[PDB]
């Protein structure tokens with residue numbers, strides 16, 4: 001049962017310390033990570049309402065010039081499909097995904113979801129060979145299916161995720177009923193210190209984070225030293241209230257957790273929820289020693305692997 005959040009910093013809210021960090025409003029930071037661009041749009045008209053300040057770098061033109069244009073004008077070949085894919089009232093975790101061409105090498109990956117009457121559009125560069133087929137997940141199901149018990153399933157799952165991603169460290173972090181956690185399986189680069197069997201306090205993943213991770217199953221920090229980029233305007237004009245960014249992997253990470261990562265020597269972090277009968281059972285928690293952007297198709301593969309593992313855990317715990 002999480003505490004109510006305090007206002008964010010840009011609404012004059014308090015600075016976040018170790019005494020009050022269960023109240024940080026981590027879903028509404030008003031800013032994104034700088035490896036991509038974000039726009040928000042009205043869900044019926046398509047009118048562009050908010051843009052990240054770096055939008056020109058990715059889109060080829062200025063925020064001041066794109067704001068107020070409609071997606072029917074800007075994205076004539078995707079706007080109908082996007083509308084159809086995310087009708088009003090659909091789940092905020094449902095996504096639309098398209099690949100677009102741009103001035104530069106590779107393409108732009110476009111990911112869109114709906115929160116209330118607002119469409120949230122994320123653009124991130126992707127290379128062409130950075131395609132992942134459905135075989136990656138398909139072939140991986142095999143070793144997960146043959147694991148004979150829960151711990152063997154956890155060990156195969158961390159090894160499969162490390163093989164798919166190349167991450168330096170991949171853990172399965174399981175929550176206890178008091179919300180403390182334990183690393184129950186770990187695949188890691190030879191010579192990295194082991195976290196296997198280590199337990200952590202509940203405060204390391206505070207209650208409002210555990211709530212958010214029950215609904216939006218994947219989040220990441222691509223570069224634990226990168227400054228966030230503001231959305232402008234920072235509040236959603238539809239509501240004159242903060243924009244919920246829980247559903248956007250580009251959402252800026254809590255500064256408090258960015259510090260926690262830098263203290264562990266982590267350059268890039270990503271985790272996928274394992275949700276069992278609607279409760280958060282644990283996380284697939286990954287680190288890399290340097291900044292790294294896992295490509296969008298691999299992320300989506302990992303999400304699916306989390307849902308598959310959640311079912312296999314749920315099967316075995318009933319035994």
Ligand SMILES: *C/C=C1/C(=C/c2[nH]c(/C=C3[NH+]=C(/C=C4\NC(=O)C(C=C)=C4C)C(C)=C\3CCC(=O)O)c(CCC(=O)O)c2C)NC(=O)[C@H]1C
Pocket residue numbers: 017018019020021022024026181195200203204205206209219220221252253254256257260269270271283285286
């Ligand atoms: C006073 C507030 C604190 C707190 C804030 C906090 N932590 C998170 C998110 C995560 N914490 C994680 C914990 C671990 N990563 C590990 O490697 C290990 C053990 C080896 C642990 C225990 C994890 C996995 C996450 C999820 C995100 C990720 O995978 O990188 C947040 C929310 C971050 C966000 O989504 O914006 C917050 C606010 N951590 C503290 O320790 C105290 C200081």
